[PDB]
């Protein structure tokens, strides 16, 4: 519950800022921006292609994306690279949904991403020290 | 799809035989019996206690059990010990549901177990050679 709310907060705020323009949580958002933005840049062409293959017709259509994320981890491997890649693809998708409909919300998207992440990887996240661990892994000097 | 149907078959048949009395698939069932029965025996007291904590009021009530299984793997670790333990606990639960209602079916239970297993661990199962890998891991001489 604690980890859910904290994750929802961070992911939601990132997707909101991405769809528009706006402790660890501050650090986590600052890290999510740097890494997530880079992911989206390096892989823009690929991301657009994937967006073409999937559907997502509106704000509420997330079931498609959920299956994609669940399939990402189905090989039994977990790491921060994968978690942040999926969030960044979520941000990319949030941008797309806002373009087609300027008064759609990211809130359902962010909850679906959070849901998968937290429900499927709760103990791993806890062992990795949650968002503090996220910040430390991507830390640069 | 192939792995889903094959897994559904094996898990369903095991739970059916457990709730009542009746290639790799034959070997897998033969292995599932030996290991699954032993799990249930060694841990009968513990299994009964867990059954007390959960609810499962009938055949269709599986959402509770699904969350338990998903939480088992949330630490990011996968192995056959866990997969077969969950199936055995599923068999134990199938026995319980049949006792309270002699004309209830295991079919929804087996599908929920299969669903979690296959959807969340598809690539891992494939890399472990599916049910052939299951048979080999528990092989005794």
């Amino acid at each position: 519950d604690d980890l859910y709310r904290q994750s929802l907060e961070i992911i939601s705020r990132y997707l909101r800022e991405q769809a528009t323009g706006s402790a660890a949580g501050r650090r986590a958002l600052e890290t999510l921006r740097r890494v997530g933005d880079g992911v989206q840049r390096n892989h823009e062409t690929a991301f657009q292609g994937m967006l073409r293959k999937l559907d997502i017709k509106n704000e509420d259509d997330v079931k498609s994306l959920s299956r994609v994320m669940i399939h990402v981890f189905s090989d039994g491997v977990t790491n921060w690279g994968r978690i942040v890649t999926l969030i960044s693809f979520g941000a990319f998708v949030a941008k797309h949904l806002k373009t087609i409909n300027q008064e759609s919300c990211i809130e359902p998207l962010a909850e679906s991403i959070t849901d998968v992440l937290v429900r499927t990887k709760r103990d791993w996240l806890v062992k990795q020290r949650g968002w503090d661990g996220f910040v430390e892994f991507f830390h640069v000097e | 799809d192939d792995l889903y149907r094959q897994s559904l078959e094996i898990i369903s048949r095991y739970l059916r035989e457990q709730a009542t009395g009746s290639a790799a698939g034959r070997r897998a069932l033969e292995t599932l019996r030996r290991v699954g029965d032993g799990v249930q025996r060694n841990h009968e007291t513990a299994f009964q206690g867990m059954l007390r904590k959960l609810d499962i009021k009938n055949e269709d009530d599986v959402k509770s059990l699904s969350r338990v299984m998903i939480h088992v793997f949330s630490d990011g670790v996968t192995n056959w010990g866990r997969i077969v333990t969950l199936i055995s606990f599923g068999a134990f639960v199938a026995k319980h549901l049949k006792t309270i209602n002699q004309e209830s079916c295991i079919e929804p239970l087996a599908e929920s177990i299969t669903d979690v297993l296959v959807r969340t661990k598809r690539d891992w199962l494939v890399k472990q050679r599916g049910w052939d890998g299951f048979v080999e891991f528990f092989h005794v001489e």
Partner: peptide, 19 residues
């Protein structure tokens, strides 16, 4: 769907090994 999943998993694992 599953199989854009596997090819997010090229880009993530090979981000994971950048860090």
């Amino acid at each position: 769907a599953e199989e854009i999943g596997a090819x997010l998993r090229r880009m993530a694992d090979d981000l994971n090994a950048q860090y």
